[PDB]
Amino acid sequence: FTLIELLIVVAIIGILAAIAIPQFAAYRQKAFNSAAESDLKNTKTNLESYYSEHQFYPN
Template identity: 65%
Template sequence: MGIKQRVQKGFTLIELMIVVAIIGILAAIAIPQYQDYVTKSKWGTNISDLAATKAAVALCLQNNAGDGTQCQTAAQLSITALPQPKYATAAIGVVGAAGKVTVTYTGTAEVGSYVYSADWAVDASGTKITFTPVAADTIPAKIAAATLR
């Protein structure tokens, strides 16, 4: 009679621990990146919710020779109401000044409670609106690049 060979049926404890450690490392890297991705996506929605207002502000600034004080209310902008971004805790605030309009609102806790605050102005050519974040703006660049606001 020959020697019987043992056939392995399953995994050893070390093998299982290695697999769990690998999954843990991958999760530690992936979860924060996924959360940033979701927040970035929701801030994209907030910013795109302002599209009609951006066009109205640009037109108002052009029609009023860059006088932002004439572009602070929905009526002055010729729109029915100032928008409420989907992930914002309060309606946008619009403050006009010479050559610009400053738009500000705070995101919900779901999107990090960051503050959007940017000066909107017509560029030198008079055909394009520019957006410049101001000191009150707290959105990190990894969430929304300054050029996209």
């Protein structure tokens, strides 16, 4: 209710809004690379599964 208090509130809000958030692009790239890894491993397993019914890999 005092013009000093509101100015201090504005200053503290400006201080708090400048917090450095963590990097997110690399964080998501981690998940993307893990997805690629899992896909490759599952593809290897599926290919070796196919090599059981017949005696040759695809093509």
